[PDB]
Design a protein around this ligand. Structure first.
Ligand SMILES: *[C@@H]1O[C@H](CO)[C@@H](O)[C@H](O)[C@H]1NC(C)=O
Ligand SMILES: [K+]
Length: 207
């Protein structure tokens, strides 16, 4: 094989398409991926719906999450579901309907900082959202022992948030947005998808 085999691929998990392709009808925040996506239109619709049971996650576990904060979580979800440029960060986990996950996606420090700043006023009860919720109500709720606190209590720094939230799905890069060496969670599609060249950078040959 070749390192370029990790370019333009979709991870093997849950909703993902088998291979990347255009999706003219991606919804709202996911539309920047419309030219080449690993998500379907339906997935993009459902992830925007706070009460969806097709895409079930309760962002309002500690009262209503501020829109300025929630938008980042939606954006994170669009990148996760739709990106065809995260091949270099795929890791095998081999769970039911979830063969792969992401490991250490090098999120631009500016995207991490802004996410954290915008979520400073909001509340949560957990520093790792990937496991441990009480799901007996039908949606995730704060489990025993987990008190609602300011985001800053559970995530003292932006790195704590981006790296901790989904068990190291991101690793903060100190490169700048548009360096071509860190993944942007937020980008407009006007001038193409800037993460294509980022994947190519990390896929370049050894030595
Ligand atoms: C980013 O900068 C911080 C603060 O100096 C440092 O701790 C961390 O190792 C850096 N991360 C990189 C270079 O990926
Ligand atoms: K992308």
């Amino acid at each position: 094989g070749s390192r370029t085999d990790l370019l333009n691929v979709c991870m093997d998990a849950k909703h993902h398409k088998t291979k990347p392709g255009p999706e003219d009808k991606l919804h709202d925040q996911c539309s920047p991926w419309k030219k080449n996506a690993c998500c379907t239109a339906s997935t993009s619709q459902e992830l925007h719906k706070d009460t969806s049971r097709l895409y079930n996650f309760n962002w309002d576990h500690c009262g209503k999450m501020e829109p300025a904060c929630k938008r980042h979580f939606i954006q994170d979800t669009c990148l996760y579901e739709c990106s065809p440029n995260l091949g270099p960060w795929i890791q095998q986990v081999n769970q039911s309907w979830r063969k792969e996950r992401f490991l250490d996606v090098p999120l631009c420090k500016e995207d991490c900082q802004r996410w954290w700043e915008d979520c400073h006023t909001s509340h949560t009860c957990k520093s790792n959202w990937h496991r441990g919720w009480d799901w007996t109500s039908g949606v995730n709720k704060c489990p025993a022992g987990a008190l609602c606190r300011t985001f800053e209590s559970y995530f003292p720094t932006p790195a704590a948030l981006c790296e901790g939230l989904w068990s190291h799905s991101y690793k903060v890069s100190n490169y700048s947005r548009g360096s071509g060496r860190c993944i942007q969670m937020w980008f407009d599609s006007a001038q193409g998808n800037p993460n294509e060249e980022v994947a190519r950078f990390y896929a370049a040959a050894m030595h």
